[PDB]
Design a protein around this ligand. Structure first.
Ligand SMILES: NCc1c[nH]c2nc(N)[nH]c(=O)c12
Ligand SMILES: NCc1c[nH]c2nc(N)[nH]c(=O)c12
Ligand SMILES: [Zn+2]
Ligand SMILES: [Zn+2]
Lengths: 369, 369
């Protein structure tokens, strides 16, 4: 396999389906990436993550640098070896967690929430950490402006992000092993403003990246506004490269974003809300803690092919979650990630067959019935 | 398979190895039974429990009656179906948790620690709950005297326990489906007193049970005293039936107890201490939280055949446990239960080959080096 190759096999309107080939494996798109916060997809062995259908997982640079440490992971053989996942890993840059402390044009300094120790992030240090981890898809370090943002502040943050995108590009390229084996994605900023999104897209395309993320969304704006911004923002990006919507999201957000040209997604929703008792179903989410499930012998979802729905009832999972049992988190998480992967597979198949618009309509009618 | 058949294949001194055949499966002895508190062996799917080598698991009557409820489990198809374990299950009677609230010759009434609701246990109700759960090995309901106990109080509790053993026998026998498909074990009491242990053994043998537990030990007395009581107590029990030491224990306790004629064990140690960071190894226990393991690439144990030791390092598990990650509990628990099963297999093989005394000596020399 090549370092990086994105091929589009089929299209329907703005939606695309295809593959990204990388040294560690093939990624089917549109793709959902389970989030591995601190070198684990919470409550799942990597083999279980793979069995759900995941082709790639996300690791968080900010968290890994705090614990167990980037240099430590490198000494131990890199993130893949450390956690036992041998397929591609995308790492975020830290820009989001920095927003979520001294800031300057050079970068940011901040105190660890775990120990109070002082840490620094910059385009150069973020790229270095992602190298030490050994990630396959490296994200440029950006400045993420909060929502809502004034036009002036959105412009200033976008302009800084573009300067930092060039610094990220140069840092990545200067490291031979990284440049030859990994890929680098740029991140579009500009808040909700069309002119700023255009300037950002133009700057990123001039620099040149392997993929382009739409940054700064899902920050409080709501679905209608997010979709409106995607309507104009995604077509600004190079058509022949993957389009990644960071930190999205709910199943309906994913379907609508694919309709608008997005190829890649990550979010903590299926894992985090799984541990809290929320299970995704084709008829919409349910909260398994609800007393109505205490004697319900049906599986979490009636059609789901996952191992949890093959083997255990709602009633059992209800009991586990109510009791605070670890197995409850395990089963809920496996089902939710499997559900997300089945959603992505239905999306890919429907685009390939030219019936994605119908799928989206049918999905929504049932999910929100 | 028959309802119950215990066969002894080989002996060495007081130690025995063999099999218990039951309708749901064969149990190799000496056996270790992982503890499923509230219908789950904590942090493990039943298939993982089985893969470690477990032939039977324990369920706690006291906890299950409080949550999710015995009648509820029965309505849902019984404990095996509910939790997805199709092999034998032994249920304890509740006598221990009652000690751990109004007491009388009829039984005990108590308040739920979860809800404050009032509950009752008696020989008849305990046997009924174990029936509703559908367990394969049912334990008689006893009164467990605290350690230390005066001779008078030990005698009174033992005598009550024997009256309750007869009531348990009669309750079990009066329920056709239970009598025909499950087995019933009696529990010897008498604290540390030889004459009381003899009276108890004689009473239980007169009533007649499928198996005999040594109750009331591991209550604070320490290993030397426990071994001393086992020295005289186990030979009092019928030789041709299984001997079960309840709530034991550490690997060295197990080896010494097998040397004294015990066939079955259960304890929360490998699961509970696994979640806390303690990992069992042939060179003794380690606490994986210790900073010395932060960059240790070796598996938890150098010889262990378990999947955790095949795939992940001490350094990784150290990180997971320090971070409070669920996967840490999962991996520690799987390894510890697998370690216990490998210990039982080495015990069985060494007895079968007439080299158990040597095995015990070699095990101790290395474990305590
Ligand atoms: N939802 C926006 C988002 C999530 N994660 C991110 N990481 C980075 N570096 N930038 C971003 O804009 C975002
Ligand atoms: N270690 C003693 C023990 C553990 N569990 C028990 N359960 C019962 N019914 N009786 C007992 O004596 C014990
Ligand atoms: Zn499912
Ligand atoms: Zn192991």
């Amino acid at each position: 396999r090549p370092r990086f190759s994105f091929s589009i096999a089929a299209r329907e309107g703005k939606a695309r389906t295809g593959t990204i080939e990388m040294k560690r494996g093939v990624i089917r798109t549109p793709a959902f990436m389970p989030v591995g916060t601190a070198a684990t997809v919470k409550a799942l062995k990597p083999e279980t993550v793979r069995a759900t259908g995941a082709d790639i997982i996300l690791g968080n640079t900010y968290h890994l640098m705090l614990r167990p440490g980037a240099e430590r992971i490198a000494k131990l053989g890199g993130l893949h070896s450390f956690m036992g996942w041998d397929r591609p890993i995308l790492t975020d840059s830290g820009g989001f967690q920095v927003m979520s402390t001294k800031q300057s044009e050079e970068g940011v300094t901040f105190k660890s929430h775990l120990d109070g120790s002082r840490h620094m992030l910059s385009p150069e240090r973020s790229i270095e950490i992602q190298h030490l981890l050994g990630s396959d898809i490296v994200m440029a370090f950006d400045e993420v402006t909060p929502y809502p943002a004034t036009p002036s502040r959105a412009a200033s943050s976008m302009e800084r992000s573009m300067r930092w995108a060039k610094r990220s590009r140069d840092a990545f390229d200067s490291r031979k092993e990284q440049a030859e084996n990994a890929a680098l994605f740029g991140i579009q900023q500009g808040s909700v403003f069309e002119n700023l999104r255009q300037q950002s897209a133009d700057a990123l395309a001039e620099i040149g990246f392997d993929g382009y993320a739409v940054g700064g969304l899902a920050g409080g704006e709501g679905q209608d506004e997010m979709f409106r911004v995607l309507d104009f923002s995604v077509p600004m990006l190079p058509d022949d490269k993957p389009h990644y919507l960071m930190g999205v999201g709910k199943p309906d957000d994913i379907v609508g974003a694919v309709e608008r040209g997005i190829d890649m997604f990550d979010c903590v929703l299926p894992t985090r809300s799984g541990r809290n008792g929320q299970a995704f179903t084709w008829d919409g989410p349910i909260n398994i803690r609800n007393a109505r499930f205490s004697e319900d012998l049906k599986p979490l979802d009636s059609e789901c092919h996952c191992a949890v729905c093959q083997k255990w009832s709602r009633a059992y999972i209800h009991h586990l979650i109510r009791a605070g049992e670890i197995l409850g988190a395990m089963l809920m998480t496996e089902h939710n990630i499997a559900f997300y992967q089945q959603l992505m597979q239905k999306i890919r198949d429907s685009i390939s067959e030219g019936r994605f618009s119908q799928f989206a309509q049918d999905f929504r009618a049932r999910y929100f019935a």
